[PDB]
From Swiss-Prot, chain A:
This is Complement factor H. Homodimer. Also forms homooligomers. Interacts with complement protein C3b; this interaction inhibits complement activation. Interacts with complement protein C3d. Interacts with CR3/ITGAM; this interaction mediates adhesion of neutrophils to pathogens leading to pathogen clearance. Interacts with complement factor I. (Microbial infection) Interacts with West nile virus non-structural protein 1 (NS1); this interaction leads to the degradation of C3. Expressed in the retinal pigment epithelium (at protein level). CFH is one of the most abundant complement components in blood where the liver is the major source of CFH protein in vivo. in addition, CFH is secreted by additional cell types including monocytes, fibroblasts, or endothelial cells. Sulfated on tyrosine residues. Another study observed glycosylation at this position. Changing residue 90 to A: In AHUS1; about 30% loss of C3b binding. Glycoprotein that plays an essential role in maintaining a well-balanced immune response by modulating complement activation. Acts as a soluble inhibitor of complement, where its binding to self markers such as glycan structures prevents complement activation and amplification on cell surfaces. Accelerates the decay of the complement alternative pathway (AP) C3 convertase C3bBb, thus preventing local formation of more C3b, the central player of the complement amplification loop. As a cofactor of the serine protease factor I, CFH also regulates proteolytic degradation of already-deposited C3b. (Microbial infection) In the mosquito midgut, binds to the surface of parasite P.falciparum gametocytes and protects the parasite from alternative complement pathway-mediated elimination. It comes from Homo sapiens (Human). The chain holds residues 1109 to 1231 of 1231 of the full protein.
Swiss-Prot record, chains B, C:
It comes from Homo sapiens (Human). Changing residue 170 to R: Impaired binding of C3d to CR2. The gene is C3. Disulfide bonds join 108-165. It comes from the Eukaryota. The chain holds residues 996 to 1287 of 1663 of the full protein. This is Complement C3d fragment. Changing residue 117 to A: No effect on binding of C3d to CR2.
Length: 123, 294, 294
């Protein structure tokens, strides 16, 4: 086993080195607000590394985008909101707007960098 | 070129805890840097170089006592880690590796902590435990437009450490880009001359200082020789040094002469309470100028 | 579209007590509201928005110092609560909800007190402790048809808070209907253009502006472009603004253009003595108009 694989938005918790084989285990951590998916630990055996984990993306919610949807955050932290993978976010329609037909909720969940923005139409 | 003889005082022995040790380390490191690049060791006394080096080694060694297991730094081992200080250590060590033997693990470990712990998803860096010595952070002390200024400061540190750490820290290039993203998206709303200077150097380093942005950076200079704001004049020395380094990046050699002259006109020689950023920055830029003579 | 640059003076830091704080809060909230709706933060400058938001937080926060246990407001904690002030606070806060964090407890608690403590069984809202700054209430100062003018003003605040408060205040929809009942009952007996304009808008929101009532309202406009009475023009600016908002509620797009023309032709950008209501009302009406452009 040579050097452990790289993962996006993460890194091994230890100072890398070029000679491992075998039995060796390295651990990964993700960047702030990213969510580790898979076993934190990878191991060396038979020359190959066992599959490393991956870092599920958070979502960053901006007024810039929300404005296109005539929407705002319910618990008004900005303007800007970071939400981790798995966490739901609660919007309101902005003054003078209603949920709109093709939209089912003002509360949606972030998945690996994807969040549905509810549409609001205007009465 | 600031005459060697006017710099004898920048050679100091470092002391104190996690912040003060860096305050003393700074002048000596940047002084050896400037003297090397300007080739004034004859006018200064070559035999003095070795002694300065020993002082720098001493600074580096006692700084390691404030390295936390996470690889971050603070004034004291059990004070919450400072984003700013950790980046500042990266900035100094990343220069000092050329003067003395610095352990890559210490430097790149600080880099990985910054990246994996303190950068936000949109690329901004956040300070969660401000330094005690608010006088060592230069124009950042003015607390407003802080995301952009802190993000710029850290990004520059990261760019400084890139060639040294990219190997041990895979996430480095992506971190740099994402911070570049944030500075770019908001560079036009910048008001303070200080920020346009420091963010401008950060973007220029990447090649993202262009079009309207380039124009805005160039047209913030008063009299086309300095970047300044009302308030503490060290900030203006510092900011204008950032711009000099940015302009030097753009190869805009036809703009630098005034700026270089205004800086030399300041007759500023660094050192003293509150002089940390201005001292490091003034001598780094002019050093850069002297090696960039076409 | 009142040129953005011409609104710099509306960004003001709030100061003083229960009443004067609300007088400072007013130009700032409504200017930010207006620039949000007309999307003019580019002609005005996007970096100014964040500063203005801080000003709004300040006002809202220092206004809490004058909230009374009953959830109502007065200029001083020791002074009998004003019906009109409390209702105006609800109007301002309600319109700031997407701007800053407004505690539903403050908002709806004031709504509850208005209804359970200051509405009559017939529906009318009554002032038992008039504000000190009589210049901050615009056209309500003319003490004719007060029962109607006060009822409409308060009801309008209630309609503004309905969405957020209907859940926490069970009596709300009842109170709204009852006030409405009183309005249409005596609307035809109205003489003052101000009153027919502010009561008109109130009824129009519920759809209760119809038949002869709708007829009277429309025909009370002089030159079919303004609502007005002898006295200060500011009252007529305020009254024509309510009228305009009423027409929009009626989707009567055939009647508005002359109205919107007359207002713009008054060239009144807020500010000056006793400006509160004319400032809040004109910019609310003009913004609504831009949002409604088919």
């Amino acid at each position: 086993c040579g050097p452990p694989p790289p993962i996006d938005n993460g890194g091994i918790t230890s100072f890398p080195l070029s000679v491992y084989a075998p039995a060796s285990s390295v651990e990964y951590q993700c960047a702030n607000l990213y969510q580790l998916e898979g076993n934190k630990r990878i191991t060396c055996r038979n020359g190959q590394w066992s599959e490393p984990p991956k870092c599920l993306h958070p979502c960053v919610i901006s007024r810039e985008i929300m404005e296109n949807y005539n929407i705002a955050l319910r618990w008004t932290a900005k303007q800007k909101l970071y939400s981790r993978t798995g966490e739901s976010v609660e919007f309101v329609c902005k003054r003078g707007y209603r949920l709109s037909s093709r939209s089912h909720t003002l509360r949606t969940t972030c998945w690996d960098g994807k969040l549905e923005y509810p549409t609001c139409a205007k009465r | 070129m600031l005459d060697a003889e006017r710099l004898k005082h920048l050679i100091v022995t470092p002391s104190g805890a996690g912040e003060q040790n860096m305050i003393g380390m700074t002048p000596t490191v940047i002084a050896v840097h400037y003297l090397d690049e300007t080739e004034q060791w004859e006018k200064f006394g070559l035999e003095k170089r070795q002694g300065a080096l020993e002082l720098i080694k001493k600074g580096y060694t006692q700084q390691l006592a404030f390295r936390q297991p996470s690889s971050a730094f603070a004034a004291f081992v059990k004070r919450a880690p400072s984003t700013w200080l950790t980046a500042y250590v990266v900035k100094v060590f990343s220069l000092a590796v050329n003067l003395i033997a610095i352990d890559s693990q210490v430097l790149c470990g600080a880099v990985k902590w910054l990246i994996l712990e303190k950068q936000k998803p949109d690329g901004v860096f956040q300070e969660d435990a401000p330094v005690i010595h608010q006088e060592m952070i230069g124009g950042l002390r003015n607390n407003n437009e802080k995301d952009m200024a802190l993000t710029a400061f850290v990004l520059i540190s990261l760019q400084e450490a890139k060639d040294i750490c990219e190997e041990q820290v895979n996430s480095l290039p992506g971190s740099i880009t994402k911070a570049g993203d944030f500075l770019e998206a908001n560079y036009m709303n910048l008001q303070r001359s200080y920020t346009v200077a420091i963010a401008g150097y950060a973007l220029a380093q990447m090649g993202r200082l262009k079009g309207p942005l380039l124009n805005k950076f160039l047209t913030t200079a008063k009299d086309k020789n300095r970047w300044e704001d009302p308030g503490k004049q060290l900030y203006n020395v510092e900011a204008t040094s950032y711009a000099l380094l940015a302009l030097l990046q753009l190869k805009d050699f036809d703009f630098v002469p005034p700026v270089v002259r205004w800086l030399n006109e300041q007759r500023y020689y660094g050192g003293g309470y509150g002089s940390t950023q201005a001292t490091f920055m003034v001598f780094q830029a002019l050093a850069q100028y002297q090696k960039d003579a076409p």
